[PDB]
Amino acid sequence: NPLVYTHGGKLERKSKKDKTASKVFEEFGVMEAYNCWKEASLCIQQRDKDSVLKLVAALNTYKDAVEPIFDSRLNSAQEVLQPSILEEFFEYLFSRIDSIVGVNIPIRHPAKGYLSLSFNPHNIETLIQSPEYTVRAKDHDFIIGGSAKLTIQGHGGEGETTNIVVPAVAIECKRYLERNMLDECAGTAERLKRATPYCLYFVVAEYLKLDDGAPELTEIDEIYILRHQRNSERNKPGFKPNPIDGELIWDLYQEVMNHLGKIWWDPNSALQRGKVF
């Protein structure tokens, strides 16, 4: 049961490197709001429906305090520390699964989810002696999974070892999602399902900025719209930004846990059942 602290680390990084930001952080109480949020999140230790809603409330409080400062008073923040808020939130929510799942999960944070291996030999002698190979992986905002160590030895016997991460759930977190970002995901999804067919893949957005006509839902498991609002509303008459929806975080928590709770690949279970996944 550990935490990586994605957002907090980046707040720590920024306060040494960017003295504009460092000054603004302390001046407007970014640090205090964060510490409140961090410790308030660590306080909720059971995982019934109600408990999760309490966790969501802590997230909403933090964003209300901190995001208006980022938007109006900093340049290098929108895609530098803002998106890591959701990333760290999910670190908290899933920090207590080892007990439930009944084994030590090493990966519950952003990491690179394995997609494929392919062989690119420099020359003929190379191919035969020990060929160079390449591992493609996608950066994901939040991965639950295990690590392994891939290895190739050629005719010349000296090994090539790469540290890879084979995911159970991969989650993308955006402030608002538009179609060129969805299409990024749509292409990931194909590749990720091929790498780990029983990997679950979610897209987590607060706002939707999608192109009218029917979006393909194809191959992405679920797409979350946590604030139930269109992005065009943000500048419209009588706008009030909705809170991140605790029922959908709860849905996600349940679907994850259900995914973790099942039997995934089983040749004999295919027979008797019929169906693979």
Partner: protein, 259 residues
């Protein structure tokens, strides 16, 4: 159109045959099918419970057991993936609940360009638009297409399936190839493969990607059991056919395009 691919096959075999026709009448084939067809007809929509799906499967085996023996006796030759190899690619061909439409058991695969000349390209450029004959297709709906005044009539599919007696490794590879093409044309579409018995020649496990499910109707470990003339006899299990509601569920889902 009321497509019984198999009964149309009977219409055709009886008409062209004569010797096959005398065989049908003496072997009670049309009758045997009618007995089977009527027992399923008893199973209606209200009767599409778990109990009814099993009752239908029992009747199916009665028929297929009698069908097989006529081909597998001394009567005689052209009786392979023609007759028996088209009994299972029909079943609950028509639903009731959603029942949007479909667009038949074939689907428009894709298109390529193949013009002879520069002048011909301006006049009307040659294309080659594919469509394979799959076992059974259920579609969402609907079109035709025109390309430089060349019109071709479009099927857009929700589900596709082959039905085979047995699956080996090298066939499974080619089946994988078919599915890649399918998914390219029609993103959302499910592809199923349905077989009775499984003959995985290497024990090595099989290609997950792009095949959206494979089903074993007999749940039978190896085909060889059945092939080997012996005590070993398979069973068409109703529970296996019951869990092919995945198709129905998916089809229904696409009708209701909302939030």
């Amino acid at each position: 159109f009321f497509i019984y691919e198999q009964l149309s096959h009977k219409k055709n075999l009886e008409q062209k045959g004569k010797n096959a026709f005398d065989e049908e009448t003496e072997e009670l084939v049309r009758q045997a099918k009618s007995g089977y067809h009527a027992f399923i007809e008893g199973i209606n929509y209200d009767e599409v419970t778990k109990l009814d799906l099993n009752s239908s499967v029992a009747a199916l085996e009665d028929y297929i057991s009698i069908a097989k023996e006529i081909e597998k006796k001394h009567k005689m030759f052209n009786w392979r993936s023609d007759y028996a190899g088209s009994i299972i690619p029909e079943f609950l061909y028509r639903i009731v609940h959603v029942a949007t439409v479909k667009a038949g058991l074939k689907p428009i695969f894709s298109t390529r360009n193949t013009i002879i000349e520069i002048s011909g390209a301006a006049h009307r450029e040659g294309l080659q638009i594919r469509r394979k004959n799959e076992d059974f297709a259920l579609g969402f709906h609907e079109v035709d297409v025109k390309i430089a005044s060349e019109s071709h009539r479009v099927i857009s599919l929700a589900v596709a399936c082959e039905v085979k007696t047995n699956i080996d490794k090298n066939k499974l590879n080619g089946l994988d190839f078919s599915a890649e093409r399918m998914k390219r044309t029609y993103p959302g579409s499910a592809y199923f493969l349905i077989t009775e018995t499984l003959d995985f020649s290497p024990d090595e496990n099989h290609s997950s990607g792009l095949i959206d499910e494979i089903y074993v109707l007999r749940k039978q470990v190896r085909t060889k059991n059945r092939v080997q003339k012996a005590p070993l006899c398979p069973s068409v299990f109703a529970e296996l056919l019951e869990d092919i509601l995945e198709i129905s569920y998916r089809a229904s889902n696409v009708k209701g395009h909302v939030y």
